[PDB]
Amino acid sequence: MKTLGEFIVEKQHEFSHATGELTALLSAIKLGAKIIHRDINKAGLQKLDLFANEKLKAALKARDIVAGIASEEEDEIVVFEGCEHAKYVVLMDPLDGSSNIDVNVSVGTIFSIYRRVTPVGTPVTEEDFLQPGNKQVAAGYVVYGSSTMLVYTTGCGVHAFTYDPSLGVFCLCQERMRFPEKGKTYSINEGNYIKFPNGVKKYIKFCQEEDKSTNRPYTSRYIGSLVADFHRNLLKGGIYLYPSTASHPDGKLRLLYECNPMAFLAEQAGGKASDGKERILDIIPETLHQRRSFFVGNDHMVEDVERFIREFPDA
Amino acid sequence: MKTLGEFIVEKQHEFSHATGELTALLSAIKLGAKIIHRDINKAGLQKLDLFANEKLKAALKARDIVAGIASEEEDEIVVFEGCEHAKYVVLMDPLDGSSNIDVNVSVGTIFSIYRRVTPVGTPVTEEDFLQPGNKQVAAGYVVYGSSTMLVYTTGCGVHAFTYDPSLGVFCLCQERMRFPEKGKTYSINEGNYIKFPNGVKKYIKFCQEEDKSTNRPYTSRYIGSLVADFHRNLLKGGIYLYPSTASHPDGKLRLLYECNPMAFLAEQAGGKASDGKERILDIIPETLHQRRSFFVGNDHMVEDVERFIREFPDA
Amino acid sequence: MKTLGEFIVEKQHEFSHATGELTALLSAIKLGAKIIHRDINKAGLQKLDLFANEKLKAALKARDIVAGIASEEEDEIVVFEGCEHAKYVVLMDPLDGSSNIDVNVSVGTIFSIYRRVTPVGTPVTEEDFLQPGNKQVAAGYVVYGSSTMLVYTTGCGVHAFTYDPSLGVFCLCQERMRFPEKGKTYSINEGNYIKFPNGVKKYIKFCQEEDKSTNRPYTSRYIGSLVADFHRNLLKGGIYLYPSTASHPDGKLRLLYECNPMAFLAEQAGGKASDGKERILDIIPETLHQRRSFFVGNDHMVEDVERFIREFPDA
Amino acid sequence: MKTLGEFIVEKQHEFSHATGELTALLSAIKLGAKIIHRDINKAGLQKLDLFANEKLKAALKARDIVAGIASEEEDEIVVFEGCEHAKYVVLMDPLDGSSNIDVNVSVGTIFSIYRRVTPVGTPVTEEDFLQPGNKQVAAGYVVYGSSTMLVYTTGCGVHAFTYDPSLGVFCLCQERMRFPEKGKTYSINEGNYIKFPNGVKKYIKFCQEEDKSTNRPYTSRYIGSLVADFHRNLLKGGIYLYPSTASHPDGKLRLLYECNPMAFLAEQAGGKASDGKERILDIIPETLHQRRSFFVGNDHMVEDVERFIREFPDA
Ligand SMILES: O=P(O)(O)OC[C@H]1O[C@](O)(CO)[C@@H](O)[C@@H]1O
Ligand SMILES: O=P(O)(O)OC[C@H]1O[C@](O)(CO)[C@@H](O)[C@@H]1O
Ligand SMILES: O=P(O)(O)OC[C@H]1O[C@](O)(CO)[C@@H](O)[C@@H]1O
Ligand SMILES: O=P(O)(O)OC[C@H]1O[C@](O)(CO)[C@@H](O)[C@@H]1O
């Protein structure tokens, strides 16, 4: 058995070799993950979003390693007083899958870590949080399901750890997660069908056609939690889609707090992350809460989606 | 706080007032639930189906309260040697949602309890397991999600309990679960679209139409675990569908191990359970592993499905 | 692995064959044990005595199996309203080893169960609680140490179970506990030396003499918790002593809440329990809070104590 | 609530301000503590000494922060291959209180940390482990009792943390532990009376005299585990004694693995640690497994012991 902290130490080559800092950063994350897990694993016994938000903020501030954070739950960025010396910033989706807490269905936490651009000693600015996904030095998520797992990458593969309640520690369970050769599952809220872009509706149809030669029709799975749907598709192969709709002209997901980190992860796993046309990681952010269409998963599936959008433009 | 065992004692009027027996029966179930939960909550650290199966069988035999069991994992019924005196039989789906174990997604256990028809002292026969759903004296499920819960009914409402890891006991969290007034979510594997009965495809379309007056289009949620999808729809309102397809001419779900218990539960919660035409609970079983189309959830939604099937017969 | 409840079922011959009742009784005890354990295992994170007291009382009342209880923490007996039909009474030392809670040292719970003498339907009276130890139908203790264990007897051996935090259940770990052939440890608060009866001081000296032929000098162990000292001496052999002193003319331990149950246990394990002269179990109680000198453990050691008291009377 | 790791960060002034290293060191310790706790909390469900030994060694090697270790269970010192660059060495008593594991009585782990004297890059030598107690830069213990706690010091007070099973993390419960103004408990194995040094026997007598003005006679407590007896005496006041006997001419405790660390702790808490004549921390070690008489606890009590030894020399 190998713990997360022991793995961090063992993989010196990652994170620009600043091993000491990576341990402090993830230590904050897992502590928050342990705390949130505790409240969630006893939910029965707009509320937990705030709790997760506060717990993660406080833990990150307590390691005196982060200069400030950006949260999907907050309007502005949060500058940690006394941490003007820190050189890292974190963006996070404290609790992804809000509609799943009360139903005892999987939810998760997403985090994205960037190295600040603004001078140390001084206070961080939106400038530090509006960097393109391709500049992240770290990203990952925590999934609170039948078991609680932490998954992350720094640019050298996707590593997964499982919390062992018997010990109270996270243990390595998979060192190099990779999408399988092909996918056969699509995850999308088909309820919003009529309002989907025409190219996406064509793709859906494609998925439902009978062609055993290509494993079609595909299987449909949609948990309602991006972290949970992503996790499954990475292990079993599949694609997750959330295009623009009536309610969300520019998609629903936040580009900075959700799209980029999951994109950095999908890619490090051999997958692909797109907004239907361009690479999510190369998009230049314009606002802190900018949303974006998201298509992530097996490369061939995302490509298919991209192709249908091409051949069938304008919803 | 009130435990499951203390609730059993307090609700003497239920289970034909044979309180002592109900406690032994559920004690077996929760023990199995605790054991399975342990292996599942540490899965990372066709396999668990067998483990759950053996654990539940052994626990039920150890209470010397059940005469024999029928399992979805077994070809024949299991007669408990030395229990020919027992007067109850149990049918069970040890682990529902096989495709979810490896992905850390919710799975569950389903159980159905009948009073034997064959004379005590003698060994139980399929006759005891081929009774119609409306004769069950008890039914329920265990859902292993962000938290582990046990849900059951004996004919007087649906009761839910949450496992408290801090104590190692199940506590009441909801004494009378009821479907809300209306539902706005449909759960079905849309991947199998083209092969669905024509009436179901029409219903799907119905669900996707824009009519704010009726909360349409509906939301789409499909976890892939019947227990998890059912649980959510009961708390939030919704319908779960699994019609006949190419792969499953008579639906996929087993009538005795899955349909009947969930049906007894849906009904006790104010919902409705149908195979598209008739009431699941009044169907006379023909074989031990008989499958059946299943439509369960809010009454108005099931009725809609029934109506479309009527107006659009033959797939 | 075998659980406590499964062991209860398997040993039908015990408890006058009223198996159903024994399960309800111990179920109350272990629930209280689980609850107390939870608060104790997080003490750091005259107070717990009250908490343990209330929790045990409530659990016993909730099984609707006990008519009333007598507690070392209470002045009077407690009559359970609505339980006038119950036919069992319980005496208990909710938290034995008060001076050990704050220091993270072992403490325990002791319980004694009698069948009532007064007519059912009517309310129990002190008469039901002032019966001699030899009439107990059940007795045992819970020890909260490095691990939490429940130990009990109904008159057919001493059975021990260990709480498995991984499962949240008590498992059999020893079905027939017996004192070893000989003991080599004495447990007494030697601080109260000068005030000990002369016969006891002689015995102490005896214990400290050099005579390898008899394993002397003996080892001295005194945890300060009767349950913890008893437990060790039963597994490893030894004697526990608490004679009369300046502060306690009639010993410190309560005859009904501490002496009798531990005596019933010592005896069932092949040991012996005395007040220095007579058998604890045959003493006729005079008051609810009557105290008594106590000498329990390996038979040969208790006999030695009895002999010195004889040869050296009057402190 | 504040975690151990967050406290480490907050107390930068300690450990020569090399905060990053202290976190890695204690991280190893607590991981070992979590692992051992797991096996101990399920002992029922010469053996654990070895298990604790291996687990602690491996954890320390995995942080790549220690150059080598000295264990009470090992004949020679252990040089960590690949860690010749490390600049810290650790001496440890993996499992203190061997005679307590099987009886579910408290046991603990003791550790002592020194900065190496030999050149980095090269392999550590006994020279690095034979330094006097006053050169330790860190010391502490883990006590596995009703709850599991970690206690340590670097020279600025004694800090205690309690493991929270609900979270799987150690939380601060006491930042500055100090012996109370006076003590009233003595901990010694009085079984070895006749062979004790004459001065110690006089002290024992002293402890048993009646003099309410000085809280005499004192209370006697002896758990059999040095870590557990020490812990209690520090919280409640008291003295722990283990003089030379027939079996142990130079006392039983090891000077390096037990005496020094506990001494560094006693002192940092306002107490005193002596071998009956000189200060334990200033003794120059001669051998790796050198034993020594030990008298630790409230300063006035140790002084009394020292005085009686003076006035009554030669056993
Ligand atoms: O309810 P909808 O429209 O399907 O949105 C679900 C999506 O929203 C989120 O809950 C929040 O971004 C995602 O986790 C999930 O994929
Ligand atoms: O993979 P499919 O065809 O969607 O089937 C999923 C269904 O099968 C089961 O896993 C087994 O009955 C159900 O729990 C679930 O609803
Ligand atoms: O503090 P003392 O006088 O040694 O008494 C300790 C005894 O008192 C109790 O704490 C209470 O009866 C026992 O558990 C223990 O054996
Ligand atoms: O069995 P004895 O001689 O009292 O020795 C007990 C002492 O030995 C140890 O178990 C080992 O050093 C200590 O923890 C304890 O204080």
Side-chain angles (χ1 to χ4, degrees):
Chain A
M1 181 274 276
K2 188 180 299 177
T3 72
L4 169 61
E6 292 175 342
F7 182 86
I8 298 298
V9 174
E10 163 179 347
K11 302 302 173 181
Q12 292 175 51
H13 292 306
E14 299 188 10
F15 204 64
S16 175
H17 319 292
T19 305
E21 286 164 1
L22 184 61
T23 296
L25 293 180
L26 290 168
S27 281
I29 298 301
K30 78 172 177 177
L31 173 65
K34 286 185 181 187
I35 295 164
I36 296 170
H37 166 53
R38 181 189 178 177
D39 260 54
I40 297 180
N41 198 192
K42 293 190 299 184
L45 312 172
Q46 58 140 298
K47 194 290 179 298
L48 188 59
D49 295 301
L50 178 62
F51 178 77
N53 188 58
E54 289 307 316
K55 297 302 169 175
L56 284 167
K57 285 162 61 183
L60 285 170
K61 174 165 180 170
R63 293 299 160 164
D64 175 54
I65 211 290
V66 185
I69 69 96
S71 181
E72 176 162 326
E73 311 292 353
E74 316 243 351
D75 271 296
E76 319 293 352
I77 63 176
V78 184
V79 179
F80 289 152
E81 187 171 68
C83 297
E84 303 63 34
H85 65 75
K87 54 198 173 185
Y88 291 107
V89 293
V90 180
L91 289 74
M92 62 175 189
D93 183 11
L95 209 51
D96 158 88
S98 51
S99 63
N100 293 299
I101 293 293
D102 311 315
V103 292
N104 186 39
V105 169
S106 288
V107 290
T109 291
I110 305 171
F111 62 100
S112 178
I113 309 182
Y114 287 89
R115 206 187 177 193
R116 69 179 308 173
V117 306
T118 58
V120 300
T122 73
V124 291
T125 63
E126 293 208 328
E127 172 171 42
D128 297 300
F129 301 89
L130 293 172
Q131 303 183 52
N134 71 61
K135 302 297 169 50
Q136 301 170 93
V137 289
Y141 59 82
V142 171
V143 46
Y144 311 99
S146 38
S147 80
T148 296
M149 304 165 79
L150 184 153
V151 180
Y152 83 89
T153 180
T154 64
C156 313
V158 181
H159 322 299
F161 300 75
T162 300
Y163 176 64
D164 185 334
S166 308
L167 288 173
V169 307
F170 278 90
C171 308
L172 176 65
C173 61
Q174 219 164 312
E175 175 181 0
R176 169 205 182 65
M177 296 198 290
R178 303 279 299 181
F179 284 88
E181 191 195 312
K182 291 293 180 178
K184 298 152 293 190
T185 308
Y186 68 104
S187 306
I188 186 173
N189 186 320
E190 272 192 276
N192 303 319
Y193 186 72
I194 63 180
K195 36 202 168 185
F196 284 157
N198 193 42
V200 184
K201 305 169 76 180
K202 291 302 183 177
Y203 179 66
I204 301 303
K205 298 297 184 175
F206 173 81
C207 299
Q208 310 180 315
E209 290 170 350
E210 229 283 301
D211 176 50
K212 306 164 191 171
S213 67
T214 64
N215 300 299
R216 296 190 294 153
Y218 295 142
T219 304
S220 171
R221 287 296 191 270
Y222 195 66
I223 293 173
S225 168
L226 166 60
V227 167
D229 285 305
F230 182 93
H231 190 69
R232 180 196 62 240
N233 294 345
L234 160 60
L235 285 173
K236 301 294 173 180
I239 174 179
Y240 167 99
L241 314 85
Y242 204 122
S244 63
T245 55
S247 304
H248 302 291
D250 298 307
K252 174 190 180 176
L253 314 191
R254 307 296 182 171
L255 177 60
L256 312 170
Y257 314 101
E258 301 173 90
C259 293
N260 275 324
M262 299 311 263
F264 184 14
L265 288 166
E267 272 182 27
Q268 285 293 149
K272 184 174 164 65
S274 154
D275 68 10
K277 303 166 183 178
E278 28 176 330
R279 186 196 182 198
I280 289 289
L281 293 178
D282 291 323
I283 299 181
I284 310 295
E286 301 174 356
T287 60
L288 238 192
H289 291 80
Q290 186 185 336
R291 297 170 187 275
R292 198 71 167 191
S293 296
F294 198 51
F295 304 94
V296 67
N298 277 80
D299 52 26
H300 69 108
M301 300 186 92
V302 183
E303 293 162 4
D304 288 325
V305 169
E306 283 180 351
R307 212 189 64 259
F308 281 98
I309 291 186
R310 226 139 56 213
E311 278 158 36
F312 298 90
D314 191 54
Chain B
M1 181 274 276
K2 188 180 299 177
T3 72
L4 169 61
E6 292 175 342
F7 182 86
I8 298 298
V9 174
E10 163 179 347
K11 302 302 173 181
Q12 292 175 51
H13 292 306
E14 299 188 10
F15 204 64
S16 175
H17 319 292
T19 305
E21 286 164 1
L22 184 61
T23 296
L25 293 180
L26 290 168
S27 281
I29 298 301
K30 78 172 177 177
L31 173 65
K34 286 185 181 187
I35 295 164
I36 296 170
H37 166 53
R38 181 189 178 177
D39 260 54
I40 297 180
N41 198 192
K42 293 190 299 184
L45 312 172
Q46 58 140 298
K47 194 290 179 298
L48 188 59
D49 295 301
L50 178 62
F51 178 77
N53 188 58
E54 289 307 316
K55 297 302 169 175
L56 284 167
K57 285 162 61 183
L60 285 170
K61 174 165 180 170
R63 293 299 160 164
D64 175 54
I65 211 290
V66 185
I69 69 96
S71 181
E72 176 162 326
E73 311 292 353
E74 316 243 351
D75 271 296
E76 319 293 352
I77 63 176
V78 184
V79 179
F80 289 152
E81 187 171 68
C83 297
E84 303 63 34
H85 65 75
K87 54 198 173 185
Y88 291 107
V89 293
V90 180
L91 289 74
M92 62 175 189
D93 183 11
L95 209 51
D96 158 88
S98 51
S99 63
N100 293 299
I101 293 293
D102 311 315
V103 292
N104 186 39
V105 169
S106 288
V107 290
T109 291
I110 305 171
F111 62 100
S112 178
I113 309 182
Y114 287 89
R115 206 187 177 193
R116 69 179 308 173
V117 306
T118 58
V120 300
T122 73
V124 291
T125 63
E126 293 208 328
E127 172 171 42
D128 297 300
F129 301 89
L130 293 172
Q131 303 183 52
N134 71 61
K135 302 297 169 50
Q136 301 170 93
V137 289
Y141 59 82
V142 171
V143 46
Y144 311 99
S146 38
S147 80
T148 296
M149 304 165 79
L150 184 153
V151 180
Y152 83 89
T153 180
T154 64
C156 313
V158 181
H159 322 299
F161 300 75
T162 300
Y163 176 64
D164 185 334
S166 308
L167 288 173
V169 307
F170 278 90
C171 308
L172 176 65
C173 61
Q174 219 164 312
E175 175 181 0
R176 169 205 182 65
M177 296 198 290
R178 303 279 299 181
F179 284 88
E181 191 195 312
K182 291 293 180 178
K184 298 152 293 190
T185 308
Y186 68 104
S187 306
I188 186 173
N189 186 320
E190 272 192 276
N192 303 319
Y193 186 72
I194 63 180
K195 36 202 168 185
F196 284 157
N198 193 42
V200 184
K201 305 169 76 180
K202 291 302 183 177
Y203 179 66
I204 301 303
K205 298 297 184 175
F206 173 81
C207 299
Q208 310 180 315
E209 290 170 350
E210 229 283 301
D211 176 50
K212 306 164 191 171
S213 67
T214 64
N215 300 299
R216 296 190 294 153
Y218 295 142
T219 304
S220 171
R221 287 296 191 270
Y222 195 66
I223 293 173
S225 168
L226 166 60
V227 167
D229 285 305
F230 182 93
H231 190 69
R232 180 196 62 240
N233 294 345
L234 160 60
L235 285 173
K236 301 294 173 180
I239 174 179
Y240 167 99
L241 314 85
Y242 204 122
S244 63
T245 55
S247 304
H248 302 291
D250 298 307
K252 174 190 180 176
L253 314 191
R254 307 296 182 171
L255 177 60
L256 312 170
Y257 314 101
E258 301 173 90
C259 293
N260 275 324
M262 299 311 263
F264 184 14
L265 288 166
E267 272 182 27
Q268 285 293 149
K272 184 174 164 65
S274 154
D275 68 10
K277 303 166 183 178
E278 28 176 330
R279 186 196 182 198
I280 289 289
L281 293 178
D282 291 323
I283 299 181
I284 310 295
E286 301 174 356
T287 60
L288 238 192
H289 291 80
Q290 186 185 336
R291 297 170 187 275
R292 198 71 167 191
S293 296
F294 198 51
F295 304 94
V296 67
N298 277 80
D299 52 26
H300 69 108
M301 300 186 92
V302 183
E303 293 162 4
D304 288 325
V305 169
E306 283 180 351
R307 212 189 64 259
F308 281 98
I309 291 186
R310 226 139 56 213
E311 278 158 36
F312 298 90
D314 191 54
Chain C
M1 181 274 276
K2 188 180 299 177
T3 72
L4 169 61
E6 292 175 342
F7 182 86
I8 298 298
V9 174
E10 163 179 347
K11 302 302 173 181
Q12 292 175 51
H13 292 306
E14 299 188 10
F15 204 64
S16 175
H17 319 292
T19 305
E21 286 164 1
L22 184 61
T23 296
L25 293 180
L26 290 168
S27 281
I29 298 301
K30 78 172 177 177
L31 173 65
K34 286 185 181 187
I35 295 164
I36 296 170
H37 166 53
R38 181 189 178 177
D39 260 54
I40 297 180
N41 198 192
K42 293 190 299 184
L45 312 172
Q46 58 140 298
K47 194 290 179 298
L48 188 59
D49 295 301
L50 178 62
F51 178 77
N53 188 58
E54 289 307 316
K55 297 302 169 175
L56 284 167
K57 285 162 61 183
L60 285 170
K61 174 165 180 170
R63 293 299 160 164
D64 175 54
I65 211 290
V66 185
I69 69 96
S71 181
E72 176 162 326
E73 311 292 353
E74 316 243 351
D75 271 296
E76 319 293 352
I77 63 176
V78 184
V79 179
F80 289 152
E81 187 171 68
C83 297
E84 303 63 34
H85 65 75
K87 54 198 173 185
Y88 291 107
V89 293
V90 180
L91 289 74
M92 62 175 189
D93 183 11
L95 209 51
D96 158 88
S98 51
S99 63
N100 293 299
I101 293 293
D102 311 315
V103 292
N104 186 39
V105 169
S106 288
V107 290
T109 291
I110 305 171
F111 62 100
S112 178
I113 309 182
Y114 287 89
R115 206 187 177 193
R116 69 179 308 173
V117 306
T118 58
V120 300
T122 73
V124 291
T125 63
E126 293 208 328
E127 172 171 42
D128 297 300
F129 301 89
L130 293 172
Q131 303 183 52
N134 71 61
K135 302 297 169 50
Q136 301 170 93
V137 289
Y141 59 82
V142 171
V143 46
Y144 311 99
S146 38
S147 80
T148 296
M149 304 165 79
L150 184 153
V151 180
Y152 83 89
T153 180
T154 64
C156 313
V158 181
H159 322 299
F161 300 75
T162 300
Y163 176 64
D164 185 334
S166 308
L167 288 173
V169 307
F170 278 90
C171 308
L172 176 65
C173 61
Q174 219 164 312
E175 175 181 0
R176 169 205 182 65
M177 296 198 290
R178 303 279 299 181
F179 284 88
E181 191 195 312
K182 291 293 180 178
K184 298 152 293 190
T185 308
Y186 68 104
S187 306
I188 186 173
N189 186 320
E190 272 192 276
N192 303 319
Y193 186 72
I194 63 180
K195 36 202 168 185
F196 284 157
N198 193 42
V200 184
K201 305 169 76 180
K202 291 302 183 177
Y203 179 66
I204 301 303
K205 298 297 184 175
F206 173 81
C207 299
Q208 310 180 315
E209 290 170 350
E210 229 283 301
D211 176 50
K212 306 164 191 171
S213 67
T214 64
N215 300 299
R216 296 190 294 153
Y218 295 142
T219 304
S220 171
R221 287 296 191 270
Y222 195 66
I223 293 173
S225 168
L226 166 60
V227 167
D229 285 305
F230 182 93
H231 190 69
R232 180 196 62 240
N233 294 345
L234 160 60
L235 285 173
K236 301 294 173 180
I239 174 179
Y240 167 99
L241 314 85
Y242 204 122
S244 63
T245 55
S247 304
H248 302 291
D250 298 307
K252 174 190 180 176
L253 314 191
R254 307 296 182 171
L255 177 60
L256 312 170
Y257 314 101
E258 301 173 90
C259 293
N260 275 324
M262 299 311 263
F264 184 14
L265 288 166
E267 272 182 27
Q268 285 293 149
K272 184 174 164 65
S274 154
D275 68 10
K277 303 166 183 178
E278 28 176 330
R279 186 196 182 198
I280 289 289
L281 293 178
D282 291 323
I283 299 181
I284 310 295
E286 301 174 356
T287 60
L288 238 192
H289 291 80
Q290 186 185 336
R291 297 170 187 275
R292 198 71 167 191
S293 296
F294 198 51
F295 304 94
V296 67
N298 277 80
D299 52 26
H300 69 108
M301 300 186 92
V302 183
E303 293 162 4
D304 288 325
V305 169
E306 283 180 351
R307 212 189 64 259
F308 281 98
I309 291 186
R310 226 139 56 213
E311 278 158 36
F312 298 90
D314 191 54
Chain D
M1 181 274 276
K2 188 180 299 177
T3 72
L4 169 61
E6 292 175 342
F7 182 86
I8 298 298
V9 174
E10 163 179 347
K11 302 302 173 181
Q12 292 175 51
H13 292 306
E14 299 188 10
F15 204 64
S16 175
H17 319 292
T19 305
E21 286 164 1
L22 184 61
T23 296
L25 293 180
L26 290 168
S27 281
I29 298 301
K30 78 172 177 177
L31 173 65
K34 286 185 181 187
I35 295 164
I36 296 170
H37 166 53
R38 181 189 178 177
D39 260 54
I40 297 180
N41 198 192
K42 293 190 299 184
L45 312 172
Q46 58 140 298
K47 194 290 179 298
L48 188 59
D49 295 301
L50 178 62
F51 178 77
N53 188 58
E54 289 307 316
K55 297 302 169 175
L56 284 167
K57 285 162 61 183
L60 285 170
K61 174 165 180 170
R63 293 299 160 164
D64 175 54
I65 211 290
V66 185
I69 69 96
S71 181
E72 176 162 326
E73 311 292 353
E74 316 243 351
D75 271 296
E76 319 293 352
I77 63 176
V78 184
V79 179
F80 289 152
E81 187 171 68
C83 297
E84 303 63 34
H85 65 75
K87 54 198 173 185
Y88 291 107
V89 293
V90 180
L91 289 74
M92 62 175 189
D93 183 11
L95 209 51
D96 158 88
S98 51
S99 63
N100 293 299
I101 293 293
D102 311 315
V103 292
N104 186 39
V105 169
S106 288
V107 290
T109 291
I110 305 171
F111 62 100
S112 178
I113 309 182
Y114 287 89
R115 206 187 177 193
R116 69 179 308 173
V117 306
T118 58
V120 300
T122 73
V124 291
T125 63
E126 293 208 328
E127 172 171 42
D128 297 300
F129 301 89
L130 293 172
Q131 303 183 52
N134 71 61
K135 302 297 169 50
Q136 301 170 93
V137 289
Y141 59 82
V142 171
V143 46
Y144 311 99
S146 38
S147 80
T148 296
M149 304 165 79
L150 184 153
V151 180
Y152 83 89
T153 180
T154 64
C156 313
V158 181
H159 322 299
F161 300 75
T162 300
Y163 176 64
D164 185 334
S166 308
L167 288 173
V169 307
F170 278 90
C171 308
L172 176 65
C173 61
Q174 219 164 312
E175 175 181 0
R176 169 205 182 65
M177 296 198 290
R178 303 279 299 181
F179 284 88
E181 191 195 312
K182 291 293 180 178
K184 298 152 293 190
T185 308
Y186 68 104
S187 306
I188 186 173
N189 186 320
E190 272 192 276
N192 303 319
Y193 186 72
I194 63 180
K195 36 202 168 185
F196 284 157
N198 193 42
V200 184
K201 305 169 76 180
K202 291 302 183 177
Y203 179 66
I204 301 303
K205 298 297 184 175
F206 173 81
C207 299
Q208 310 180 315
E209 290 170 350
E210 229 283 301
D211 176 50
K212 306 164 191 171
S213 67
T214 64
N215 300 299
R216 296 190 294 153
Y218 295 142
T219 304
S220 171
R221 287 296 191 270
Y222 195 66
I223 293 173
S225 168
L226 166 60
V227 167
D229 285 305
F230 182 93
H231 190 69
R232 180 196 62 240
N233 294 345
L234 160 60
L235 285 173
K236 301 294 173 180
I239 174 179
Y240 167 99
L241 314 85
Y242 204 122
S244 63
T245 55
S247 304
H248 302 291
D250 298 307
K252 174 190 180 176
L253 314 191
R254 307 296 182 171
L255 177 60
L256 312 170
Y257 314 101
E258 301 173 90
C259 293
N260 275 324
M262 299 311 263
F264 184 14
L265 288 166
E267 272 182 27
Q268 285 293 149
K272 184 174 164 65
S274 154
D275 68 10
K277 303 166 183 178
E278 28 176 330
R279 186 196 182 198
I280 289 289
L281 293 178
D282 291 323
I283 299 181
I284 310 295
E286 301 174 356
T287 60
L288 238 192
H289 291 80
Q290 186 185 336
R291 297 170 187 275
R292 198 71 167 191
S293 296
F294 198 51
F295 304 94
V296 67
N298 277 80
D299 52 26
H300 69 108
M301 300 186 92
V302 183
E303 293 162 4
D304 288 325
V305 169
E306 283 180 351
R307 212 189 64 259
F308 281 98
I309 291 186
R310 226 139 56 213
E311 278 158 36
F312 298 90
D314 191 54

